[PDB]
Design a protein around this ligand. Structure first.
Ligand SMILES: NC(=O)OC[C@@H]1N=C(N)N2CCC(O)(O)[C@@]23N=C(N)N[C@@H]13
Ligand SMILES: NC(=O)OC[C@@H]1N=C(N)N2CCC(O)(O)[C@@]23N=C(N)N[C@@H]13
Ligand SMILES: NC(=O)OC[C@@H]1N=C(N)N2CCC(O)(O)[C@@]23N=C(N)N[C@@H]13
Ligand code: FES
Ligand code: FES
Ligand code: FES
Ligand SMILES: [Cl-]
Ligand SMILES: [Cl-]
Ligand SMILES: [Cl-]
Ligand SMILES: [Cl-]
Ligand SMILES: [Cl-]
Ligand SMILES: [Cl-]
Ligand SMILES: [Cl-]
Ligand SMILES: [Cl-]
Ligand SMILES: [Fe+3]
Ligand SMILES: [Fe+3]
Ligand SMILES: [Fe+3]
Lengths: 326, 318, 329
């Protein structure tokens, strides 16, 4: 049984890309300790069902079955479950109405921004906003998924931290000889956590061109999804960073990236993200304790450039998070 | 050393094939949480000793030793144990009589049907009967062993289940156009659990089976021109792991042996795919989160769960 | 960060050889459940720092950093720690004085006999003596380190046991035609555990005794370091056996060996030790329970003891008397 807090259960999380879930497909995923099955009927534009991956007859994963005639069919005795999760046929007794108990545990699913979002509980909140999604001046791309052996809150803590840039992203986002961090603007309010415009010192790459001089800001409406905005020399790049909380100690990381420069930059964008992400994963894998320490092994130390990661920890306690934190 | 229920401790289980326990040999097995050593002296027709795999001096497995002169010799300090498990020689003190505590933990062992049977407790029952063993009209063959990451009681539950045949054994035991299951006849007695004759569809065979005890099943199938029986024996390694073996006998042509073994292998591997996936691992008795649902074609597997609860089984179940 | 008994925490243990800690190097070790980082400046004859492998800012291992300008630099935000473990530079705030909390957890470290000794607590004893260290008639050599999946107290128990020699070390320390064990002399007092001189059967002629044997004795001042002496044919070999208690169930084993015979014996000595150690590891890995059983007023079945077990019984009795509960059962 999931020990996640209600505040986490009642939120939306990404579990897959829509483009990887074809009609007729069966996909597995994991969310807040729960094993999920995602399936679609073979019809074009069919919805995605997201259920607990478990047949209540003899305990077989329904994901080992098959999709047929708009049902998911268990492999073991062939019980057929309709789109609402109700068993509508037991082959051993074809004239018998299946018992009302023969029902899959179903969850909420929405497709948004080409991503599959799931809510295991009763969705109080909305899916986070992504204003550029419907802007045709912006192209889109998606990173691969990254499976990370770290708490989802440590993953997000690292992506709120800006002072590490000249050290583990040396050569892309700065150098150890330019590591001073200016005062940061941070607010935690009704819109969530927002880091105000911050100047990022970048390493020179193309000697023919002007300095990149990027300015970054971001906002988290909810604690595992970050909207990030970067203004560079002649282009804006935005992204939605979504962390899937597999369990307390493990995460999946994905980005949806949009930019209003040339579509031909997609390869460079994906490779630059991959380089930065893997540098962060080396740190994340190593951090102890695995779960994120909240405010109160020696205690964490905080300096002024930690203002936003301190605010993140404060927010998590205000939210009542106990899962994935310590 | 085992924490299994007395009702399980006092029953017989197969742990090896006799052909693998040659004179002079040392082999191992694992039963109800206990590590076992099996050994024989080099004399022809010597008996098989089955002991806990543990030298009580400094805790080394006796299976790392050697068989010498009707004794098993521990590799660490060379203490020698005779066929009764009594230490008869301590090399550091060759004239000393070894203390009474210098004694291997021994278990009951009987060879039957070409199989090595072990009882860790006090045998209250005989080894299950297999009447065709003495019928020379029937040929015999043995499957290989199958190591399964599932509770032994889930392994047997899967074998008692007949309604899954059309879905995971299509072409050998079932037909997806004939998935309906007729009314089943099941009885639980002091003779054990018995399922009455049942039509299989694959032609049309008639099958029945009986379990005298919960982890050994006698199965009988009559086809057009042939009867096939088997003894299915499941070694309960622990609560969560099993060894599966079959002794198969049939009264048709001797030439059918390789096809019989191939068909069994196909069916067994199809079942193992399901067994490895089932959660929870241990077999739920009557009373993933939701509780089991039962329909009429589950009559025999429901009776099996009821029998285990009546017997007081708590090991390997939930 | 350790559940070890105070009697173990306040003792010295070897965690590395000095030759594996070159100037500028970062290495790791593990002691009583604590992850350690060992580092030195690039300077000639720089000291060895041994710290908990942990940056208290955001919990990254300092062993993932780099040595620069006689400081250890954390890879994540570049905090620089001096040889005393004090943070002297926070690059995000270059003119700010680091808070007093910005300090690595440091441990007592000493180099002796070419080995790196560490005490995680407050050392009550000196490092064991090794008198031949100063003697110019003795050559020295070092085995490699051996990682063993067994309790450090089982590792030492196996090294105090002599009656197994004819059975698992046949041809180096005994043979099965010479398996009888003489009455053993054992004492446990202020000096620790001592086994008195006893005869080990070999294959080479001893010119002092006029048969194929050697004379061995050993002493443990503390439960995980053994001084061992062996004499045959006018040549003497001594060693210091040091066990690193990684945690309750795992060990590192090292030997420092000195001998007064030919320098050409060195490779033979190393090969003999490697064979004997691997023979013992085969047994150690198989033993159950993993932790060393102590003696109990009571009655898996309890161990059995015979007279040739006198010194390993004394070892178990000593550990109970000392109050050891970690790595034993
Ligand atoms: N050019 C490039 O790789 O940018 C990465 C992109 N921009 C940041 N400032 N990052 C800091 C942390 C981070 O996760 O890498 C990210 N945060 C979000 N949302 N997207 C990333
Ligand atoms: N032709 C073939 O593979 O038959 C398998 C054989 N016969 C059955 N009806 N089975 C159903 C289940 C089962 O375990 O496979 C088995 N039960 C026993 N005792 N033997 C097997
Ligand atoms: N020639 C050779 O390999 O000798 C091993 C050497 N000498 C002993 N008598 N041993 C007995 C046990 C043991 O651990 O192998 C050891 N104990 C210590 N201190 N050093 C080893
Ligand atoms: S386990 Fe799913 S139909 Fe029986
Ligand atoms: S451990 Fe078996 S003889 Fe010593
Ligand atoms: S974690 Fe070491 S400097 Fe930040
Ligand atoms: Cl469909
Ligand atoms: Cl579609
Ligand atoms: Cl019906
Ligand atoms: Cl023999
Ligand atoms: Cl035959
Ligand atoms: Cl049985
Ligand atoms: Cl001590
Ligand atoms: Cl000494
Ligand atoms: Fe980063
Ligand atoms: Fe089957
Ligand atoms: Fe030894």
């Amino acid at each position: 049984m999931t020990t996640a807090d209600l505040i986490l259960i009642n939120n939306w999380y990404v579990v897959a890309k829509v483009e990887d879930c074809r009609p007729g497909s069966i996909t597995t995923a994991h969310l807040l300790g729960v094993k999920l099955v995602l399936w679609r009927s073979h019809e074009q534009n069919s919805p995605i069902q997201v259920w607990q991956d478990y047949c209540p007859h003899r305990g077989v994963p329904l994901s080992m079955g098959e999709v047929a005639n708009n049902t998911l069919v268990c492999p073991y005795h062939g019980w057929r479950y309709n789109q609402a999760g109700k068993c509508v046929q037991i082959p051993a007794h074809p004239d018998m109405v299946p018992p009302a108990s023969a029902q899959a545990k179903t969850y909420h699913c929405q497709e948004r921004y080409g991503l599959v979002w799931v809510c295991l509980g009763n969705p109080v909140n909305d899916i986070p906003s992504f204003p550029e999604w419907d802007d045709p001046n912006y192209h889109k791309t998606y990173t691969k998924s990254y499976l990370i052996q770290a708490s989802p809150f440590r993953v997000m803590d690292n992506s709120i931290d800006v002072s590490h840039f000249p050290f583990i992203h040396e050569g892309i986002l700065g150098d150890r000889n330019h590591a001073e961090v200016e005062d940061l603007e941070v607010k935690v309010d009704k819109d969530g956590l927002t880091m105000g415009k911050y100047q990022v010192h970048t390493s020179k790459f193309n000697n023919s061109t002007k300095d990149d001089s990027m300015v970054n800001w971001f906002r988290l409406s909810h604690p595992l999804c970050q909207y990030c905005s970067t203004e560079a020399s002649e282009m804006r790049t935005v992204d939605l960073m979504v962390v899937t909380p597999i369990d307390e100690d493990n995460s999946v990381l994905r980005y949806l990236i949009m930019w209003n420069g040339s579509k031909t930059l997609e390869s460079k964008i994906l490779a630059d993200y991959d380089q930065v992400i893997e540098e962060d994963i080396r740190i994340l894998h190593s951090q102890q304790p695995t779960r994120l320490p909240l405010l109160s092994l020696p205690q964490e130390i905080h300096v002024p450039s930690d203002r936003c990661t301190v605010a993140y920890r404060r927010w998590l306690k205000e939210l009542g998070v106990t899962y994935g934190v310590c």
